[PDB]
Design a protein around this motif. Structure first.
Motif, PDB file in Angstrom:
ATOM      1  N   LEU A 119       0.827  -1.201   0.000  1.00  0.00           N
ATOM      2  CA  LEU A 119       0.000   0.000   0.000  1.00  0.00           C
ATOM      3  C   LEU A 119       0.866   1.257   0.000  1.00  0.00           C
ATOM      4  O   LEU A 119       0.634   2.197  -0.755  1.00  0.00           O
ATOM      5  CB  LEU A 119      -0.968  -0.010   1.195  1.00  0.00           C
ATOM      6  CG  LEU A 119      -1.684   1.291   1.583  1.00  0.00           C
ATOM      7  CD1 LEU A 119      -2.883   1.031   2.465  1.00  0.00           C
ATOM      8  CD2 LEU A 119      -0.729   2.220   2.301  1.00  0.00           C
ATOM      9  N   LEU A 123       1.311   3.686  -3.274  1.00  0.00           N
ATOM     10  CA  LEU A 123       0.872   5.062  -3.057  1.00  0.00           C
ATOM     11  C   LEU A 123       1.993   6.018  -3.410  1.00  0.00           C
ATOM     12  O   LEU A 123       1.763   7.049  -4.044  1.00  0.00           O
ATOM     13  CB  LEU A 123       0.437   5.293  -1.605  1.00  0.00           C
ATOM     14  CG  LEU A 123       0.049   6.735  -1.284  1.00  0.00           C
ATOM     15  CD1 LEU A 123      -1.249   7.057  -1.983  1.00  0.00           C
ATOM     16  CD2 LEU A 123      -0.082   6.988   0.219  1.00  0.00           C
ATOM     17  N   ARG A 151      -8.837  12.771  -5.397  1.00  0.00           N
ATOM     18  CA  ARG A 151      -8.836  11.357  -5.108  1.00  0.00           C
ATOM     19  C   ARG A 151      -7.476  10.759  -5.317  1.00  0.00           C
ATOM     20  O   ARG A 151      -7.118   9.816  -4.672  1.00  0.00           O
ATOM     21  CB  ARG A 151      -9.911  10.614  -5.885  1.00  0.00           C
ATOM     22  CG  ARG A 151     -11.256  10.766  -5.275  1.00  0.00           C
ATOM     23  CD  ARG A 151     -12.284   9.863  -5.854  1.00  0.00           C
ATOM     24  NE  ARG A 151     -12.996  10.488  -6.944  1.00  0.00           N
ATOM     25  CZ  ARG A 151     -14.112  11.187  -6.834  1.00  0.00           C
ATOM     26  NH1 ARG A 151     -14.885  11.083  -5.771  1.00  0.00           N
ATOM     27  NH2 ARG A 151     -14.601  11.735  -7.918  1.00  0.00           N
ATOM     28  N   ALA A 159      -7.250   7.998   2.547  1.00  0.00           N
ATOM     29  CA  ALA A 159      -7.734   6.628   2.307  1.00  0.00           C
ATOM     30  C   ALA A 159      -6.653   5.624   2.686  1.00  0.00           C
ATOM     31  O   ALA A 159      -6.929   4.599   3.314  1.00  0.00           O
ATOM     32  CB  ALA A 159      -8.129   6.444   0.843  1.00  0.00           C
ATOM     33  N   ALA A 160      -5.413   5.928   2.320  1.00  0.00           N
ATOM     34  CA  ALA A 160      -4.301   5.050   2.640  1.00  0.00           C
ATOM     35  C   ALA A 160      -4.160   4.930   4.151  1.00  0.00           C
ATOM     36  O   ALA A 160      -3.973   3.834   4.689  1.00  0.00           O
ATOM     37  CB  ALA A 160      -3.008   5.562   2.007  1.00  0.00           C
ATOM     38  N   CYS A 161      -4.272   6.053   4.851  1.00  0.00           N
ATOM     39  CA  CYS A 161      -4.175   6.002   6.304  1.00  0.00           C
ATOM     40  C   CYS A 161      -5.193   5.036   6.909  1.00  0.00           C
ATOM     41  O   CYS A 161      -4.843   4.163   7.712  1.00  0.00           O
ATOM     42  CB  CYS A 161      -4.345   7.405   6.892  1.00  0.00           C
ATOM     43  SG  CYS A 161      -2.876   8.448   6.605  1.00  0.00           S
ATOM     44  N   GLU A 163      -7.057   2.665   5.380  1.00  0.00           N
ATOM     45  CA  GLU A 163      -6.835   1.310   4.863  1.00  0.00           C
ATOM     46  C   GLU A 163      -5.713   0.596   5.603  1.00  0.00           C
ATOM     47  O   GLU A 163      -5.858  -0.559   6.023  1.00  0.00           O
ATOM     48  CB  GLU A 163      -6.526   1.335   3.359  1.00  0.00           C
ATOM     49  CG  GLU A 163      -6.551  -0.071   2.721  1.00  0.00           C
ATOM     50  CD  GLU A 163      -6.260  -0.060   1.233  1.00  0.00           C
ATOM     51  OE1 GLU A 163      -6.391  -1.128   0.616  1.00  0.00           O
ATOM     52  OE2 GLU A 163      -5.919   1.013   0.678  1.00  0.00           O
ATOM     53  N   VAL A 176     -11.324  -3.638   5.493  1.00  0.00           N
ATOM     54  CA  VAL A 176     -10.258  -2.858   4.861  1.00  0.00           C
ATOM     55  C   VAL A 176     -10.841  -1.972   3.757  1.00  0.00           C
ATOM     56  O   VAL A 176     -10.521  -0.793   3.672  1.00  0.00           O
ATOM     57  CB  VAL A 176      -9.164  -3.788   4.285  1.00  0.00           C
ATOM     58  CG1 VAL A 176      -8.236  -3.036   3.394  1.00  0.00           C
ATOM     59  CG2 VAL A 176      -8.382  -4.450   5.421  1.00  0.00           C
ATOM     60  N   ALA A 177     -11.726  -2.534   2.933  1.00  0.00           N
ATOM     61  CA  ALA A 177     -12.384  -1.760   1.881  1.00  0.00           C
ATOM     62  C   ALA A 177     -13.296  -0.693   2.485  1.00  0.00           C
ATOM     63  O   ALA A 177     -13.390   0.444   1.984  1.00  0.00           O
ATOM     64  CB  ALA A 177     -13.191  -2.681   0.937  1.00  0.00           C
ATOM     65  N   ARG A 180     -10.995   2.138   3.780  1.00  0.00           N
ATOM     66  CA  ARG A 180     -10.481   2.925   2.650  1.00  0.00           C
ATOM     67  C   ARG A 180     -11.487   3.961   2.141  1.00  0.00           C
ATOM     68  O   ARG A 180     -11.166   5.143   2.008  1.00  0.00           O
ATOM     69  CB  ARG A 180     -10.029   2.018   1.490  1.00  0.00           C
ATOM     70  CG  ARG A 180      -9.184   2.753   0.394  1.00  0.00           C
ATOM     71  CD  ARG A 180      -9.454   2.190  -1.015  1.00  0.00           C
ATOM     72  NE  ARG A 180     -10.833   2.484  -1.425  1.00  0.00           N
ATOM     73  CZ  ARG A 180     -11.216   3.615  -2.022  1.00  0.00           C
ATOM     74  NH1 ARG A 180     -10.318   4.555  -2.315  1.00  0.00           N
ATOM     75  NH2 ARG A 180     -12.495   3.807  -2.330  1.00  0.00           N
ATOM     76  N   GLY A 183     -11.893   6.727   4.668  1.00  0.00           N
ATOM     77  CA  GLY A 183     -10.791   7.673   4.680  1.00  0.00           C
ATOM     78  C   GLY A 183     -10.847   8.544   3.447  1.00  0.00           C
ATOM     79  O   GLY A 183     -10.490   9.732   3.473  1.00  0.00           O
ATOM     80  N   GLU A 184     -11.281   7.957   2.339  1.00  0.00           N
ATOM     81  CA  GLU A 184     -11.362   8.733   1.120  1.00  0.00           C
ATOM     82  C   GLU A 184     -12.414   9.825   1.287  1.00  0.00           C
ATOM     83  O   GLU A 184     -12.170  10.970   0.924  1.00  0.00           O
ATOM     84  CB  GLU A 184     -11.669   7.864  -0.100  1.00  0.00           C
ATOM     85  CG  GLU A 184     -11.929   8.685  -1.360  1.00  0.00           C
ATOM     86  CD  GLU A 184     -12.024   7.814  -2.597  1.00  0.00           C
ATOM     87  OE1 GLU A 184     -13.142   7.662  -3.139  1.00  0.00           O
ATOM     88  OE2 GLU A 184     -10.980   7.263  -3.006  1.00  0.00           O
TER      89      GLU A 184
END
Lengths: 299, 297
Positions: A119, A123, A151, A159-161, A163, A176-177, A180, A183-184
């Motif tokens: 990830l 990223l 995005r 989102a990464a944070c 996820e 996890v999804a 994500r 966070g997004e």
């Protein structure tokens, strides 16, 4: 009445301290520069999301450090892109950025989790790439393009944070999804909030740099005056004037650019709340709702 | 293509594979990729072959490190705005792509190796950019720099090669050491070339860059206080094509090139002597030959 900050941090007070320690091979220059540049909006997100699922592990902390280092490194590298004293600041700062960036990778590996390594590295790729796209832009006003960019950058980090927070406590793919997307949504509210600030003194900077953000875009689409369509051409072209910008900024306000950017934030905030409604309530859920209110309400 | 054939033939197939795996932005990434333009990948494939068959982990390791090396080269070119802007962004990309290949090795120790190396390489550039402040002619600093920089990457290449075929700690340490001795040989050779006439390329470019490589350092140490100040000019940041000219001659006259050549030769003996711990083979043969090439160049 209720102290918001407390509802947000108290439940993660101890792990916040652990993260701050962990966030902080020797050089006289190295120590000065890394030490020198050394609110935790993203680390708080990582901790809260993990606490939705379990206890914070040392992997959660390394994830948070890793992603925070990656972010810091690109901010540092961005200043660089933007007489003899110019160059100087520049050479070491690129190397500093490269260090932070390597350190970022070490922390990802110290999570002992492949997905998290995947990830963070991918990223790193994404951020590099788009932003190498901005520089080479060959062809020029849609929100769609505006949101796509968010995005791919700021919201990609948020989102990464989230996820990474979920992977770090080893929950299933759907959680996890779920994290994500959460966070997004949060990253998008955050970014739009920031874009609005630029239309106020506390000015017009994003335009000086070539950017037309949601509020402006909105005013043009709805109004379509040629004078506006014209100064906008100039902003993107890099040709607008510091004075013209103040005017387009003002045209924006008068034309409901802000009220609309604020309405959009509200939509994404509701998308986020609706997402959270699938979880049972907890001190962590409540902390996240308050976090998101504080982001939005921030001014 | 004679010495080259002894080196490449044993790993011709895996060389292809490597190249295969190696392959608006893309248009400015491949242009700078053409401005820089396989010593390191060869080393990786040969070291692995010493131990077993090349794995996909092996190849990803080579690509990974080769990209790490490329990005630092691209970042070292910030040493107006469009060119500066370009290298950083490109550099940062290649860099992120490096970590991607490291993760694709599916092997934690290699990921640890590459990321820590990325750290050291960086820090190792502030170690040289802090060096200018210091007015000293010691090789202790010189080698140190080489070990944190060029030799660290060759060591990593050898070390990752070994990890990539999952041999023990002894074998991994043996590889790392071999790679370091080769990289030191490689770096000293390079430094020497800065001293001779390359039949538009100016001699002493390194001095021109503010650095006093081994042979100069050696002259300034078994020696004519005039040169010392010509030297302090190179570090001081100011000297002219002529000064650095005569200084090079003094370096050539005070026995500065031989010492370096005989230092290269000692290191080469250590690496040769390590190889003597392995049974002879076309791989070992290819390695000893590889090492000769790195010296005769």
């Amino acid at each position: 009445s209720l102290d918001s900050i407390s509802l947000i941090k108290t439940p993660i007070e101890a792990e916040l301290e652990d993260f701050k320690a962990l966030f902080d091979d020797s050089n006289a220059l190295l120590d000065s520069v890394i030490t020198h540049i050394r609110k935790m909006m993203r680390p708080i997100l990582v901790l809260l999301v993990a606490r939705l699922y379990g206890a914070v592990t040392p992997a959660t902390l390394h994830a948070a450090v890793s992603l925070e280092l990656l972010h810091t490194a690109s901010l540092v590298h961005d200043d660089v892109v933007d007489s003899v004293n110019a160059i100087f600041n520049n050479k070491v700062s690129v190397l500093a950025g490269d260090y932070l960036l390597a350190t970022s990778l070490v922390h990802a590996e110290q999570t002992n989790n492949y997905e998290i390594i995947r990830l963070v590295s991918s990223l790193g790729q994404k951020l590099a790439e788009g932003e190498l796209l901005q520089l080479s832009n060959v062809s020029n006003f849609s929100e769609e393009v505006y949101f796509d960019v968010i995005r791919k950058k700021t919201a990609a980090l948020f989102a990464a944070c989230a996820e990474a927070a979920a992977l770090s406590v080893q929950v299933g793919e759907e959680e996890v999804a779920f994290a994500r997307l959460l966070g997004e949504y949060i990253g998008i509210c955050f970014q739009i909030k920031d874009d609005i600030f630029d239309y106020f003194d506390s000015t017009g900077n994003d335009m000086l740099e070539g950017k037309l953000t949601l509020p402006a875009l909105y005013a043009l689409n709805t109004t379509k005056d040629a004078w506006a369509e014209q100064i906008a051409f100039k902003v993107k072209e890099g040709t607008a004037t510091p004075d013209e910008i103040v005017r387009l900024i003002e045209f924006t306000k008068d034309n409901g650019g802000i009220e609309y950017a604020c309405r959009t934030i509200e939509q994404y905030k509701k998308k986020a709340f609706d997402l959270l409604a699938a979880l049972p309530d907890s001190n962590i859920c409540l902390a996240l709702r308050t976090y998101l209110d504080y982001v939005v309400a921030r001014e």
